[PDB]
Design a protein around this ligand. Structure first.
Ligand SMILES: *[C@@H]1O[C@H](CO)[C@@H](O[C@@H]2O[C@H](CO)[C@@H](O)[C@H](O)[C@H]2NC(C)=O)[C@H](O)[C@H]1NC(C)=O
Ligand SMILES: *[C@@H]1O[C@H](CO)[C@@H](O[C@@H]2O[C@H](CO)[C@@H](O)[C@H](O)[C@H]2NC(C)=O)[C@H](O)[C@H]1NC(C)=O
Ligand SMILES: *[C@@H]1O[C@H](CO)[C@@H](O[C@@H]2O[C@H](CO)[C@@H](O)[C@H](O)[C@H]2NC(C)=O)[C@H](O)[C@H]1NC(C)=O
Ligand SMILES: *[C@@H]1O[C@H](CO)[C@@H](O[C@@H]2O[C@H](CO)[C@@H](O)[C@H](O)[C@H]2NC(C)=O)[C@H](O)[C@H]1NC(C)=O
Ligand SMILES: *[C@@H]1O[C@H](CO)[C@@H](O[C@@H]2O[C@H](CO)[C@@H](O)[C@H](O)[C@H]2NC(C)=O)[C@H](O)[C@H]1NC(C)=O
Ligand SMILES: *[C@@H]1O[C@H](CO)[C@@H](O)[C@H](O)[C@H]1NC(C)=O
Ligand SMILES: *[C@@H]1O[C@H](CO)[C@@H](O)[C@H](O)[C@H]1NC(C)=O
Ligand SMILES: *[C@@H]1O[C@H](CO)[C@@H](O)[C@H](O)[C@H]1NC(C)=O
Ligand SMILES: *[C@@H]1O[C@H](CO)[C@@H](O)[C@H](O)[C@H]1NC(C)=O
Ligand SMILES: *[C@@H]1O[C@H](CO)[C@@H](O)[C@H](O)[C@H]1NC(C)=O
Ligand SMILES: *[C@@H]1O[C@H](CO)[C@@H](O)[C@H](O)[C@H]1NC(C)=O
Ligand SMILES: *[C@@H]1O[C@H](CO)[C@@H](O)[C@H](O)[C@H]1NC(C)=O
Ligand SMILES: *[C@@H]1O[C@H](CO)[C@@H](O)[C@H](O)[C@H]1NC(C)=O
Ligand SMILES: *[C@@H]1O[C@H](CO)[C@@H](O)[C@H](O)[C@H]1NC(C)=O
Ligand SMILES: *[C@@H]1O[C@H](CO)[C@@H](O)[C@H](O)[C@H]1NC(C)=O
Ligand SMILES: *[C@@H]1O[C@H](CO)[C@@H](O)[C@H](O)[C@H]1NC(C)=O
Ligand SMILES: *[C@@H]1O[C@H](CO)[C@@H](O)[C@H](O)[C@H]1NC(C)=O
Ligand SMILES: *[C@@H]1O[C@H](CO)[C@@H](O)[C@H](O)[C@H]1NC(C)=O
Lengths: 204, 368, 414, 99, 49
């Protein structure tokens, strides 16, 4: 299944404050008005990076795994939203296909009504995660509007990724592409709008 | 202020001196450009306390003591136009000094006509000055004195439309605003070019010096020096070309000061459209505004006409006017305004017998 | 000025001869609170180590390696290093760090060096011949000896072949040393490959056990997870300073600010991408940056063929930073300010001029635009000239330059 | 090494020729003005205010100078004014007369 | 038309954009120059038969 993304998957690309200004930057972004695969837990390609989103408050959705084999033959990244706080670990994992509700190791770290959005990417051995939360009027599809995602973590894990899977009731996936965007920063240094420069001739 | 880079920059020799000599000539020229337009008046003339200008109302263009001491229109003009070793320098003349020059030029023009540019300012009543400016467009001076209320009104109204245009518009003053914009864009381009690598390992000079040992760091810095010196030569060359355009524009403004403000130009379209009467300077950010007052002929009628008329076998020609007929009678009029005189031996002159002139007509010439 | 113009005579004018620049009065360094110190103490105070044939390695990652406790750990009977000096280690960074740990007699600790030989170097732990790392030991007689001999510590006595560098091998099959078959049992040239020191508390200083740890370091494509301590200065507001906030080097004045950064943002940039604000990583306040005050310095002179006095203008500088007088063009030093006004002799800027006047000095004044005049206007009054002067005016115009040509090959290549 | 000298000496000469082109354009504008001053001030009598010097222009005389020209502009300057009462017209037999 | 060269040219920053902007200013001015000379007349006057 597919649905439209509208103007979603923008994140703060750097830790730089800018105020009442328009700034043009090139990075891995989700293209505006692209369609996204919708799901109701397959292994997926990761490409250059992923925008993931869901509506969730039961926490049937619980985590992710990232790697090349994902299992045994070389190391992989496990992430779990344990109800205490998010747990992260890198190991030669051999865990089951996915844990569910009754409806060596080299690195470790410890931290429905709402749409919850996450961006994941890997650059030069650092794993970048960004996220945001908002209430939503209509659960069926991503809402027409704008909201920038903020960085959570910047993990020095070094390991390779080309595939991923959800650990987990419905969610969206779209891929980051190298795009140039023009970003609007207001008086408080929040991003409040963007132009995807390659979208159409008015955006150019 | 890196000592490592500064020693490599000496190996390029005179380039760093000759860029500053070039920009110094641009800066010194901008003061001369401003001096040659506004400083055309020998003495700071000031307006009388009485305002007996014959019904003409300059209060929109004269200084306001409650305001800098700018006019009303000069305040609209001043409101509608709006660091990596870079420095801006102040102009030699302040905006208050420029307003004292546009004040003196304007007070001289209103109180003494064209006379203050040719010698000492000689006072003349403003309605009599305007009567001479009517003679300067070939309209007889009685056409002003017989229509003075109608010329004083409609001048006052045409000045009111300048205030309404400059209050309501968002584009008309844009010829000064573009000069402000190009110079902001030029400095932002010069500063943004500090972020460029030019093929070096980094654009940050301490980053280069941290990553690499002396011999390789010297190779990387010489790329930043090459690209930043090319970036600065590109800016100074473009300011040299942009300043030549502003100097040609300042020489035109200095010529409009002399010929339109200090005089009455007979040059077609030099001082606005229509036959030129006078014009008034107002100061604006980085420039000058001329309010060109002109006479426009407006409600024409057709007439029959003849180049000469036969009297007692003599051909008569008009001294200053043109012969016209209303369909039955013959008159001579001045040429730029319909006013028919009866044809006489002192409205006209003789030259030879009738037979040579193509299209001559027969009518009586009254001998007074 | 004479050196700037390359001339012994200087004509009347204002000449730029220098740039003024306020200097960094001191250096600032700021980094996050010194935290997540590496677990070296978990090895250096373990209950006991492994037998040397099966040496025990600690992975050190994702922490700050402050070696200075080791530099001052005088209880170490040795702290050797190879490839790198110990005092340098607190400046460094690495991807992975290792600590390899064991117990041996003092007379065999001397086999733990690059290129050494003997049963420990041959069969238990081989260092590289180009080893980069450190060897640490301390006497452990009171920790590792026992009455009647502690046999729980062992070394590999013999092997079929010598170890490669960092080769680890814990297999314990009978070693057949010669033509006599091993037959699965201890005997002459059928050695069980391990032996024991049997450590007794009554042993002499070279027979006694020592606890040993070998530090080792590597830097790869994967990120530098281990680094030395980020020692930091006090924070110096309202002066010119050099600064380093995390990786952001610069020079300027640091002040408090009205800006409202988001919690993840570390520093801020102006419209042209030049940096203008920073978050202090120890106390999370937002500091503005403004440059150290700078500007052209100009020398104001009558011609040297008249006098040798000069005045000096510091363009755009406030007079606090450098008769003395603040002009709107910058501070002016060595010119007398006057309340009269005269026509401009030497131009300074923002309505100010300077001249040399009579006992003589350079003076500075607001420029005269011209004499003030009121024209005697009224309706019905006129002035008419009763006489004239014929005037001859001179006007001078350039028409041509000197004509030049260049043999571009002879200029460039001679 | 020679390629570094070629690069810098060629940039040195490009900088010079660019500034001579920009300066020759300024001297051409001055020669066009001097040629116009000779046609209008010397070969005629200009009515253009302050074109041929201050005062009302009578005539002017060219003199040569190295790299340029000098105009001696002869002008009439009014010198010794007196004040008078004035009127736009005078009234005779119920009719207005103008000068 | 080389991608390998284009990514190296992109290390020089504003130079390529400001060359194109200068030639565009020259080109727009040629239409202005022509209108300032010829478009001086308000109405398209025609001669009689
Ligand atoms: C000159 O013109 C101004 C127009 O601005 C006259 O002042 C205004 O007069 C109107 C009535 O005609 C008032 O409503 C305004 O309040 C006046 N002030 C302003 C600032 O507009 C002024 O009186 C005229 N002077 C003479 C001598 O007629
Ligand atoms: C010349 O034109 C003016 C207008 O420019 C005429 O004056 C107007 O006359 C009407 C008569 O109803 C008045 O309503 C207006 O207020 C007048 N305007 C002004 C500014 O006074 C004038 O009548 C025309 N004269 C001739 C001979 O055609
Ligand atoms: C042409 O002009 C003359 C003079 O203005 C007009 O002649 C006058 O006509 C009126 C009546 O319309 C008489 O009261 C005058 O006595 C006439 N004066 C003279 C000198 O004859 C004449 O009517 C005009 N012709 C046309 C066709 O308009
Ligand atoms: C202007 O007046 C003269 C004199 O009255 C006219 O001349 C006459 O013209 C006719 C026709 O050619 C001749 O028959 C007469 O002999 C001429 N008389 C004289 C004394 O020369 C002349 O025709 C008139 N012009 C026009 C255009 O009507
Ligand atoms: C970095 O460490 C310093 C010193 O412990 C912290 O500053 C103190 O924070 C406590 C919090 O209760 C205050 O009571 C003190 O007044 C602070 N100052 C001093 C001099 O102790 C600081 O909060 C730490 N910062 C971060 C970002 O962890
Ligand atoms: C999703 O986008 C692809 C783009 O090629 C298009 O073919 C497909 O029809 C789209 N599907 C929906 C349901 O939007
Ligand atoms: C996660 O859940 C387990 C129980 O299932 C709990 O023991 C553990 O403490 C939680 N994780 C963290 C990081 O606290
Ligand atoms: C990551 O992938 C590259 C290319 O396949 C390989 O050279 C590198 O060794 C890999 N690293 C890890 C940690 O698997
Ligand atoms: C910015 O933050 C201030 C308080 O710091 C708040 O008053 C304002 O509404 C916020 N939003 C904008 C658009 O300024
Ligand atoms: C009379 O004058 C008007 C206004 O100029 C003009 O349009 C008209 O064509 C003229 N009459 C004739 C018969 O041409
Ligand atoms: C003017 O032209 C008309 C024809 O349109 C002709 O009858 C008349 O004789 C001509 N007059 C002159 C003076 O040429
Ligand atoms: C062992 O622990 C003590 C605890 O105070 C510490 O001082 C010491 O540095 C540690 N290491 C050694 C080699 O003693
Ligand atoms: C120097 O000044 C004197 C008067 O002080 C003057 O006569 C002379 O011409 C000037 N020039 C030289 C080169 O002496
Ligand atoms: C410069 O600094 C002093 C002291 O801080 C201040 O009084 C003065 O007003 C400043 N200069 C200007 C031109 O305002
Ligand atoms: C200059 O004038 C001011 C008042 O305008 C006065 O305070 C000051 O003392 C005067 N200085 C001199 C040298 O007279
Ligand atoms: C100016 O005109 C007024 C009113 O007509 C009159 O009282 C006054 O005398 C005139 N002034 C002169 C100098 O003629
Ligand atoms: C006019 O001025 C000249 C000097 O320029 C003087 O000699 C002459 O006497 C004056 N004539 C009159 C009548 O004032
Ligand atoms: C003209 O009148 C004014 C004011 O009454 C007076 O100052 C002046 O001396 C008079 N004479 C001349 C020659 O201007």
């Amino acid at each position: 299944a597919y649905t439209n993304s509208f103007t979603r998957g923008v994140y703060y690309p750097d830790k730089v404050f800018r105020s009442s200004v328009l700034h043009s930057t090139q990075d891995l972004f989700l293209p505006f008005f692209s369609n996204v695969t919708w799901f109701h837990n397959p292994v997926l390609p990761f490409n250059d990076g992923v925008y993931f989103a869901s509506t969730e408050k039961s926490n049937i959705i619980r985590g992710w795994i990232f790697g090349t084999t994902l299992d045994s033959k070389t190391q992989s990244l496990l992430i779990v939203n344990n109800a205490t706080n998010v747990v992260i670990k890198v190991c030669e994992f051999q865990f089951c296909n996915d844990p569910f509700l009754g409806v060596n190791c080299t690195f470790e770290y410890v931290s429905f009504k709402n749409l919850r959005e996450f961006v994941f990417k890997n650059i030069d051995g650092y794993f970048k995660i960004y996220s945001k939360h908002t209430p939503i009027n209509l659960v069926r599809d991503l809402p027409q509007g704008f909201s920038a995602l903020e960085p959570l973590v910047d993990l020095p894990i070094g390991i390779n990724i080309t595939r991923f899977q959800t650990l987990l009731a419905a969610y969206y996936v779209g891929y980051l592409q190298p795009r140039t965007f023009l970003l609007k920063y207001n008086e408080n240094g929040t991003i409040t709008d963007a132009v995807d420069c390659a979208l159409d001739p008015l955006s150019e | 202020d890196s000592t490592e880079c500064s020693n490599l920059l000496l190996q390029y020799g005179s380039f760093c001196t000759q860029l500053n000599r070039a920009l110094t000539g641009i800066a010194v020229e901008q003061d001369k450009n401003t001096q040659e337009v506004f400083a055309q008046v020998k003495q700071i003339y000031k307006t009388p306390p009485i305002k007996d200008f014959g019904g003409f109302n300059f209060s929109q263009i004269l200084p306001d003591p409650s305001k800098s001491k700018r006019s009303f229109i000069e305040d609209l003009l001043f409101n509608k136009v709006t660091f990596n070793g870079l420095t801006v320098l102040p102009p030699l003349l302040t905006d208050e000094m420029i307003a004292q020059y546009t004040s003196a030029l304007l007070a001289g023009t209103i109180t003494s006509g064209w006379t203050f540019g040719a010698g000492a300012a000689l006072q003349i009543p403003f309605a009599m000055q305007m009567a001479y400016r009517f003679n300067g467009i070939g309209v007889t001076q009685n056409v002003l004195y017989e229509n003075q209320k109608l010329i004083a009104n409609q001048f006052n109204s045409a000045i009111g439309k300048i205030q309404d245009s400059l209050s309501s518009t968002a584009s008309a003053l844009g010829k000064l605003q573009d000069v402000v914009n190009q110079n902001a864009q030029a400095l932002n381009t010069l500063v943004k070019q500090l972020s460029s690598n030019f093929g070096a390992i980094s654009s940050v000079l301490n980053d280069i010096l941290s990553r690499l040992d002396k011999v390789e760091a010297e190779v990387q810095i010489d790329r930043l020096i090459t690209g930043r010196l090319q970036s600065l030569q590109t800016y100074v060359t473009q300011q040299l070309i942009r300043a030549a355009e502003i100097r040609a524009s300042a020489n035109l403004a200095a010529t409009k000061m002399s010929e339109c403000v200090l005089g009455q130009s007979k040059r077609v379209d030099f001082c606005g459209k229509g036959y030129h009467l006078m014009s008034f300077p107002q100061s604006a950010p980085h420039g000058v505004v001329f309010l060109h007052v002109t006479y426009v002929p407006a409600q024409e009628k057709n007439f029959t006409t003849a180049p000469a008329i036969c009297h007692d076998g003599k051909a008569h020609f008009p001294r200053e006017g043109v012969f016209v007929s209303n369909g039955t009678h013959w008159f001579v009029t001045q040429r730029n305004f319909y006013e028919p005189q009866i044809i006489t031996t002192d409205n006209t002159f003789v030259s030879g017998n009738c037979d040579v002139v193509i299209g001559i007509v027969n009518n009586t010439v009254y001998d007074p | 000025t004479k050196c700037t113009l390359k001339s012994f005579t200087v004509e009347k004018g204002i000449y730029q001869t220098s740039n003024f620049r306020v200097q960094p009065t001191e250096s600032i360094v700021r980094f996050p609170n010194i935290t997540n110190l590496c677990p070296f103490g978990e090895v250096f105070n373990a209950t006991r180590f492994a037998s040397v044939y099966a040496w025990n390695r600690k992975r050190i990652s994702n922490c700050v390696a402050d070696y200075s406790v080791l530099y001052n750990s005088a209880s170490f009977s040795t702290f050797k290093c190879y490839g790198v000096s110990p005092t340098k280690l607190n400046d460094l960074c690495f991807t992975n760090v290792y600590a390899d740990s064991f117990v041996i007699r003092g007379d065999e600790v001397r086999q733990i060096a690059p290129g050494q030989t003997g049963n420990i170097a041959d069969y238990n732990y081989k260092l590289p011949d180009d080893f980069t790392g450190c060897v640490i030991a301390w006497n452990s007689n009171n920790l590792d000896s026992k009455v009647g001999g502690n046999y729980n510590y062992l070394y590999r006595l013999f092997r079929k072949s010598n170890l490669k560098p960092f080769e680890r091998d814990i297999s314990t099959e009978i070693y057949q040393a010669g033509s006599t078959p091993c037959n699965g049992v201890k005997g002459f040239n059928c050695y069980f490959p391990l032996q024991s020191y049997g450590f007794q508390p009554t042993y002499g200083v070279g027979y006694q056990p020592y606890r040993v740890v070998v530090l080792s370091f590597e830097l790869l494509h994967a990120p530098a997870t281990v680094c030395g301590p980020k020692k930091s200065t006090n924070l110096v507001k309202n002066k010119c300073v050099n600064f380093n906030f995390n990786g952001l080097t610069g020079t300027g004045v640091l002040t408090e600010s009205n800006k409202k950064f988001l919690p993840f943002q570390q520093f801020g940039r102006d419209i042209a991408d030049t940096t203008d604000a920073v978050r202090d990583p120890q106390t999370l306040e937002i500091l503005d940056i403004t440059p150290c005050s700078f500007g052209g310095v100009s020398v104001i002179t009558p011609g040297t063929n008249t006098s040798n006095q000069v005045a000096v203008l510091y363009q755009g500088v406030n007079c606090t930073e450098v008769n003395v007088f603040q002009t709107r063009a910058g501070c002016l030093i060595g010119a007398e300010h006057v309340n009269n006004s005269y026509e401009c002799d030497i131009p300074i800027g923002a309505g100010i001029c300077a001249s040399y006047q009579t006992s003589q000095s350079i003076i500075a004044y607001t420029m005269s635009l011209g004499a003030e005049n009121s024209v005697a206007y009224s309706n019905n009054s006129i002035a008419i000239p009763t006489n004239f002067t014929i005037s001859v005016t001179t006007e001078i115009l350039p028409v041509s330059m000197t004509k030049t040509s260049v043999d571009c090959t002879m200029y460039i290549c001679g």
